[PDB]
């Protein structure tokens, strides 16, 4: 019923849909992350391979080549405001 419960439930499910494919089931490898970006996110349709690689590197703050849930939440946070300007 609540669109908030609904959207947040969705963001958790999307993360795990891709994080569980290879390696640690609760972090996103470059492979899993790129697929998530290209397949589920609006911001990724326009982006080229070199741009996505840059984006993924800047999402991995501790440089372990993985994007964990915290790093992923920060991603969505930026997106909220980036999508926000585009909707004006």
């Amino acid at each position: 019923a609540c669109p908030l419960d609904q959207a947040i439930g969705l963001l958790v499910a999307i993360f795990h849909k891709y994080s569980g494919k290879e390696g640690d089931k609760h972090t996103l490898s470059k492979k899993e992350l790129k697929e998530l970006i290209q397949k589920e996110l609006t911001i990724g349709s326009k982006l080229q391979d070199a741009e996505i690689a840059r984006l993924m590197d800047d999402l991995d703050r501790n440089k372990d080549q993985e994007v964990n849930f915290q790093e992923y939440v920060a991603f969505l946070g930026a997106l909220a405001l980036i999508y926000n300007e585009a909707l004006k």
């Binding site: 419960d5 947040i8 439930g9 958790v12 499910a13 795990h16 849930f69």
Partner: protein, 301 residues
């Protein structure tokens, strides 16, 4: 009641009034007490250097003074006094003591809960209370009552012999229902058993809930996901059997095994209308019945 209930904080000074006593000598008054220290009725002499003078002393005005009350000072205190009228006055006190613990903490809390199974949300800990008191939980800002669901609590109370103070623990366990609140918010609070006092509350925690996709014994993925493709081009079918090291996978079209050798993969290149149909894979094992994956409908448009 006749006995006046006195509630005093551990470590703090206490003065018990001897009602109806003359303010200056001559005074006909006598204190009698029975506490955790005496284990019996004792007269408390007003003279300096008595047995208890480091713990309890009679003041010049007849009042009983305790510099720093302790748990062992709990008990009964009685003063019998006589005014200068010959007026007989009695004072009867029942002393109970307390200490407020530090703010409670939630330790080892979970960042993420798994829907459908029990999870340890965390353990509320409270240190340094007298008397024991109790711990309770809140969920989404409302009281969380145990043994509904799915919801359970493991509680324990421990006394420190060196101070007589208590350590409380409350371990919360929940089984989140699928389709429920994806970010439940918990907090814990300590309610003093004495005196009447505001609950002490922890900062809230907000774990997320992950809902695991149901695990199929034989798993089939199709690229592209839809199983719908333009005329020409390729569809690839991929089969996995997690519980088996060397699975034997046989491909099927419309419920009939294809004339192919065992293989984990089936690629359908140059797709024409004739390649349309329901596909699936079958994992065979010696001594066990075969298992089939989900059926995938492949079409063109």
């Amino acid at each position: 009641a006749m006995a006046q209930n006195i509630t005093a904080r551990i470590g703090e000074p206490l003065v018990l009034k001897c009602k109806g006593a003359p303010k200056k000598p001559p005074q006909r008054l006598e204190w009698k007490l029975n506490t955790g220290r005496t284990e019996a009725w004792k007269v408390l002499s007003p003279q300096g250097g008595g047995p208890w003078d480091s713990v309890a002393r009679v003041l010049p005005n007849g009042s009983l003074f305790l510099p720093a009350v302790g748990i062992q000072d709990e008990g009964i205190f009685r003063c019998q006094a006589m005014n200068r009228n010959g007026k007989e006055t009695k004072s009867n006190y029942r002393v109970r003591v307390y200490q407020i613990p530090g703010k409670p903490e939630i330790v080892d809390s979970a960042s993420e809960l798994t829907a459908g199974v029990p999870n340890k949300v965390g353990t509320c800990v409270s240190e340094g209370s007298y008397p024991a008191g109790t711990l309770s939980w809140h969920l989404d800002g409302k009281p969380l009552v145990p043994n509904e669901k799915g919801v359970s609590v493991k509680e324990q109370t421990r006394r420190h012999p060196e101070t007589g103070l208590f350590t409380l623990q409350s371990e919360l366990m929940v089984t989140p229902a699928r389709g429920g609140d994806p970010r439940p918010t918990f907090s814990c609070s300590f309610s003093p058993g004495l005196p009447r006092h505001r609950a002490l509350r922890t900062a809230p925690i907000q774990p997320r809930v992950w809902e695991p996709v149901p695990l199929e014994e034989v798993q089939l993925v199709v690229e592209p996901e839809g199983g719908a493709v333009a005329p020409g081009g390729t569809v690839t079918l991929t089969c996995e059997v997690p519980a088996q090291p060397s699975p034997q996978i046989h491909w099927m079209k419309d419920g009939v095994p294809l004339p192919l050798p065992p293989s984990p993969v089936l690629i359908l290149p140059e797709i024409g209308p004739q390649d349309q149909g329901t596909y699936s894979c079958v994992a065979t094992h010696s001594s066990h019945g075969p298992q089939e994956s989900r059926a995938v409908s492949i079409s063109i448009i």
